Amino acid sequence: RPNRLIVDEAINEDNSVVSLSQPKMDELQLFRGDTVLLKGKKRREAVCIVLSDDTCSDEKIRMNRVVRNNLRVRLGDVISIQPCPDVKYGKRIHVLPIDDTVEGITGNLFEVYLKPYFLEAYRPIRKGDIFLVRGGMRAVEFKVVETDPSPYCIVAPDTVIHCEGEPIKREDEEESLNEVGYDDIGGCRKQLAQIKEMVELPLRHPALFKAIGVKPPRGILLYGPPGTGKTLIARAVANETGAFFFLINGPEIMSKLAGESESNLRKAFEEAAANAPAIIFIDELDAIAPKREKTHGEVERRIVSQLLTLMDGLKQRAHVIVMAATNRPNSIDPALRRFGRFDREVDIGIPDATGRLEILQIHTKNMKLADDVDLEQVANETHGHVGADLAALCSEAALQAIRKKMDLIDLEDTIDAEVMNSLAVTMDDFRWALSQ
Amino acid sequence: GILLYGPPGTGKTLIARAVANETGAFFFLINGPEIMSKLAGESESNLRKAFEEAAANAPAIIFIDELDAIAPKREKTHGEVERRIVSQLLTLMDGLKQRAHVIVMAATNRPNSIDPALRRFGRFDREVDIGIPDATGRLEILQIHTKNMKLADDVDLEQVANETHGHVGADLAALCSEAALQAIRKKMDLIDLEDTIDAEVMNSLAVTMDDFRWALSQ
Amino acid sequence: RPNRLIVDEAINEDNSVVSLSQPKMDELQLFRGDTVLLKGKKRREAVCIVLSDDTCSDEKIRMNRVVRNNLRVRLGDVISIQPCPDVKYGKRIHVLPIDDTVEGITGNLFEVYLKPYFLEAYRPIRKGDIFLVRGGMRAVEFKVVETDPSPYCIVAPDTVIHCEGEPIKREDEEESLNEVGYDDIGGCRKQLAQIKEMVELPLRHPALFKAIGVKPPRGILLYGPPGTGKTLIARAVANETGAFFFLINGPEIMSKLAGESESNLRKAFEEAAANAPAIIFIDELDAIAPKREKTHGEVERRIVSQLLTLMDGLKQRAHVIVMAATNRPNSIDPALRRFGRFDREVDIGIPDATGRLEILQIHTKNMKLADDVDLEQVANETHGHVGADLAALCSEAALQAIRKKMDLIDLEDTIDAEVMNSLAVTMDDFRWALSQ
Amino acid sequence: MILIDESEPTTNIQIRLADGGRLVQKFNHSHRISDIRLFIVDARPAMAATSFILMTTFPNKELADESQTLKEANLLNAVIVQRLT
Amino acid sequence: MILIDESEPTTNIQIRLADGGRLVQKFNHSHRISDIRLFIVDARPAMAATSFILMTTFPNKELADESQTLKEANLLNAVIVQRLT
Ligand SMILES: Nc1ncnc2c1ncn2[C@@H]1O[C@H](COP(=O)(O)OP(=O)(O)O)[C@@H](O)[C@H]1O
Numbered sequence A, C: 001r002p003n004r005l006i007v008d009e010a011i012n013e014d015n016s017v018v019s020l021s022q023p024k025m026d027e028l029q030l031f032r033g034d035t036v037l038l039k040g041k042k043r044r045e046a047v048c049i050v051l052s053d054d055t056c057s058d059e060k061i062r063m064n065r066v067v068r069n070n071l072r073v074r075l076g077d078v079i080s081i082q083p084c085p086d087v088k089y090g091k092r093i094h095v096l097p098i099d100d101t102v103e104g105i106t107g108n109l110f111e112v113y114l115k116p117y118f119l120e121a122y123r124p125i126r127k128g129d130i131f132l133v134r135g136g137m138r139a140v141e142f143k144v145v146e147t148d149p150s151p152y153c154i155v156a157p158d159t160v161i162h163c164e165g166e167p168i169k170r171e172d173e174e175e176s177l178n179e180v181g182y183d184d185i186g187g188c189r190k191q192l193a194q195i196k197e198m199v200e201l202p203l204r205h206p207a208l209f210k211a212i213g214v215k216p217p218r219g220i221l222l223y224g225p226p227g228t229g230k231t232l233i234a235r236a237v238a239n240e241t242g243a244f245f246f247l248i249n250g251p252e253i254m255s256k257l258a259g260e261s262e263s264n265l266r267k268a269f270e271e272a273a274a275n276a277p278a279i280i281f282i283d284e285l286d287a288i289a290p291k292r293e294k295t296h297g298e299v300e301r302r303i304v305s306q307l308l309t310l311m312d313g314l315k316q317r318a319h320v321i322v323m324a325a326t327n328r329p330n331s332i333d334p335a336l337r338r339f340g341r342f343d344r345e346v347d348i349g350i351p352d353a354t355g356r357l358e359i360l361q362i363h364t365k366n367m368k369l370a371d372d373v374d375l376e377q378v379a380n381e382t383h384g385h386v387g388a389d390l391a392a393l394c395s396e397a398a399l400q401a402i403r404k405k406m407d408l409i410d411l412e413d414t415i416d417a418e419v420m421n422s423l424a425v426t427m428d429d430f431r432w433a434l435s436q
Numbered sequence B: 001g002i003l004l005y006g007p008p009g010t011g012k013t014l015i016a017r018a019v020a021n022e023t024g025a026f027f028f029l030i031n032g033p034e035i036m037s038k039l040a041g042e043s044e045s046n047l048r049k050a051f052e053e054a055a056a057n058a059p060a061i062i063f064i065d066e067l068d069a070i071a072p073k074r075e076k077t078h079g080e081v082e083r084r085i086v087s088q089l090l091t092l093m094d095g096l097k098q099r100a101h102v103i104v105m106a107a108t109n110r111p112n113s114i115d116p117a118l119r120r121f122g123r124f125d126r127e128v129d130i131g132i133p134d135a136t137g138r139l140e141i142l143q144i145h146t147k148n149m150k151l152a153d154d155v156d157l158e159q160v161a162n163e164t165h166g167h168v169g170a171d172l173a174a175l176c177s178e179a180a181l182q183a184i185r186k187k188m189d190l191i192d193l194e195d196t197i198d199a200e201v202m203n204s205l206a207v208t209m210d211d212f213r214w215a216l217s218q
Numbered sequence D, E: 001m002i003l004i005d006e007s008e009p010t011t012n013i014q015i016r017l018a019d020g021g022r023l024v025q026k027f028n029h030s031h032r033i034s035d036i037r038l039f040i041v042d043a044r045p046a047m048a049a050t051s052f053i054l055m056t057t058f059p060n061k062e063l064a065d066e067s068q069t070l071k072e073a074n075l076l077n078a079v080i081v082q083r084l085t
């Protein structure tokens, strides 16, 4: 009952580290830097380093998705913690990459990923763990196949780290870390918090709305300029809550024959309801249901009507939440903003300078930055910029880095799809990009 | 024909449904958007089937929710199938004499939002305004939407009445709903930890004035 | 020196208390609740109780205006502190009211103000102190004429308090506490802070701008809806910084004959410059200098031109700052925002719920509130309200309290211009006012 | 008459006596407020009989639970006022 | 061999020895980090000659100034790792 904690979002970006409140570690008698054994759902375990966090609630533990995945749990779930005093320096570990994360990677896995990742870090690992290593503008996942002291150990300087070839297949319950999570969203702290509240009960405790007769929100309208990460938020909320996600793209619907549009809307809601709890995301809502006057067609008006009908046809409906994105409130038909429909709105504004920095770190996680690269400075020269602008900036910076090195590489032959790990993006690359 | 007018969420659907139930009449709902979502022709076929089924099961009430979706201001229609639908509606209603004893009720935002030919003499000739509720009304609505909740002693509905002037019934129902869901979230961390009674313990749970304050400022 | 500190604004509303940082009291070896002796300008002293404050800078001391006045200093000045171990329980003190604060007051003074103010509080006082006592919807000032252990003591339960007859005249350097100060402004923390920065050097260290060639701000435009306290801010900044204040009322100027307007603008700037450092406040700027097209007159266009000229005619100007209030930026002639003119803008917005609370406390300082009065509640039901609305609310509440008591008083004769001290404003009074 | 473990944290307390501006100052540490009372009686024998209470000022707070430690009652380096009763 | 003043604040330290996953655990208090070193030599005499350093992990910090107190070096209730050199 004291060793049981509620899973919460990581502040420490290192996948090995989980965080407790100072008081809680006191209570549990855990050493700062101790190896701890976490127990999750489906009889899964993880081993991690525990550290204190001042901002962590006494009843919560902070962990990165990597560890949440390994424990088959989600934010808000309950795990148990306990010290691991017996843990030995491992003699030898065997790791293999997951196939889908290594397509196109023609590097030396050990030299490029594993060696730097483990070097002098004293990471604990447990057999059957999936961990993530970033580098060369990619992020590779590995599964731990065997540890010498089984089933867990510390990878000490003397621990022999084996791959021994042949990427492995991804099992069903093993969610890719390439999936969108709250980890991939910068500069939306406040709004992301509201959306999480709205959705918590309906998506994580659906059994409740069979036991009671109170109405949770059904439709949430995310507003703000293009490139602000509305699609990202919806996708992330789905993934994190373990809900089914169904995308409806405005233009894709409107591209269809009169009738195949309405048929596609219907199939979307049916499939959602079938796979509930679920989120339906309607990207570019104004393409489908623009201001009542802006429609000229007759089949156009039939489509909007079909959407209103489908919204109304959602009670608890096995627990389906509809999210939709648009530029401005008044860009869409005021009838979707009616009651049993898009009755909740959230404004995803332009990010501030702090947000810009979070976005820049998110979009550089897999790059090697030279020491002269500031990011806080790039934050400061990009006042107008939205997430999509910053991502493009990092992308342009990196491609410039690559071009500079491309003449040099062609000449002393063309390593090409490799030396991308030795390559570093320099502040000069960002300046080049910042003035384009 | 009785035309109920007023802003969304004032309980026009509720009134029509209630009058049906209380008088033991058959109730047939026609939803504007639902009709307009149909293929040209399947609309008119659906209007017809509605009046036929009403008349078959009389005494009956037909409620037309969101009338302006079906029969908007004569100019606002651009379609040709759109104009056929409005005509079809005029025909069906004027074709209901004393009928098998069938009354037609319809809701809309404003008088002027719909085709004036519907406010005709043999058709929607009676209009009734369902306005924004006053502070007394707000209180009745708040009690209605709390009947099945356990309220703490510190909960003052009359207070919540007073800070919700603009609110219509649909707003107040959402308020109570948000209050209750907040009560539940507060208790959800506590419950997950000492295991998850979950779809129970909701009877021992009480919604507190703090829950309403939280909801009132959202 | 360690005993020298910089004067700063009070958090603790009790006039007897000054606040130091925890570290500073440590350093100075002062007891929490100790009587301390403060030394100011013009050979003035004050005695006060010292308490710690978490938010107070180590080099700053927080004190109310009352004590700033007694020490003849202003925010930012330097005082010296020292413990007062010798301070005795006083045998007898003699106090008299200042004439201008007691006009209309036909009460006991001792029973209504002094007795409750001193009762069991253990206030230190020094001969020649002016202190303030609030009550009966007034605030009365008293001067300490004599203390038995001279020149200071503690007013202990056994201390005899004399106030035998004859209000005294106000000396020249003795500023009324009825003057507007920062303590009269609620819910503007951020903006009031900016304005104070802008004005600090030009108004408090004017000699600097003769020693250097850097340009301080000249014109500050305060915008926001009516009743937000723009006039209040300007008046307060003047008072607090000891600058001369000159009011120009838009309508008053425009009410004059063509020519007597321009003559009045000129006289205003001349008189300011003559009495610098000075603030000129232009209330209702849009009455004088509306959007270039909105003027239809020809004398109207001459007036706006005359204003631009007068702004430009302010060089080092000795040290004259022009402040002006308007509803919106776009309501006034854009040439006023040109560089040498109104080049600084500050938005005085609608107050939030915390601000609303500060305003409600400010406008109730002199009332007796019943225990059932919850200002935080009144804060919550007044979302749209601006300062001027809240002040009206308190005023309506108080007048309702008085009407309720007026039938009772007329009948058993009419104490009338008294008994207003025993009267208490109840939550029922505020509800009544809140629905009017 | 009062014993101070010099190995333990320590603090000074200034006692404002009602019997005139009597300013007594004494070192203590994890002593109880009741130890302040004892010290007062010790220093002014005459008061062994007299009825009094201890409080802080600004605001007035009566130190009602004398079993509390100076640390617990947040009285480190504080002025304590004796009020007759 | 290590002397603990029971009347002072105390703490446990866990040492991860290089030489295998040797986990030693010991009460200390206002001891210096250099006291951890002598405790280590005391418990594994062989290391008396061997050259090693003490560090924390996540992030790696080498405890370079061994004259610092466990409290000053923020090492209360910490795992200290021995790295050979
Ligand atoms: N807040 C953000 N944090 C991180 N990346 C972002 C953010 N906003 C946008 N991006 C990046 O730009 C891309 C475009 O964003 P998208 O989800 O399509 O937003 P929208 O739907 O508002 O256009 C995202 O996939 C992501 O790579």
Ligand SMILES: Nc1ncnc2c1ncn2[C@@H]1O[C@H](COP(=O)(O)OP(=O)(O)O)[C@@H](O)[C@H]1O
Pocket (backbone or CB within 6 Å): A339, B007, B008, B009, B010, B011, B012, B013, B014, B015, B107, B141, B144, B168, B169, B170, B171, B173
């Ligand atoms: N007067 C009212 N009394 C009780 N509940 C009301 C009232 N008005 C609205 N509501 C609530 O709002 C919900 C939605 O209103 P609805 O019946 O659709 O009215 P309208 O058709 O005018 O929007 C109702 O189901 C009910 O829960």
Ligand SMILES: Nc1ncnc2c1ncn2[C@@H]1O[C@H](COP(=O)(O)OP(=O)(O)O)[C@@H](O)[C@H]1O
Pocket (backbone or CB within 6 Å): C184, C185, C186, C187, C188, C225, C226, C227, C228, C229, C230, C231, C232, C233, C325, C359, C362, C386, C387, C388, C389, C391
């Ligand atoms: N922020 C405030 N704090 C305290 N009182 C305020 C505040 N704003 C307005 N008031 C009160 O309302 C009156 C109206 O404010 P005023 O100075 O005329 O503002 P404005 O110049 O913006 O119209 C003030 O004199 C004051 O008594």
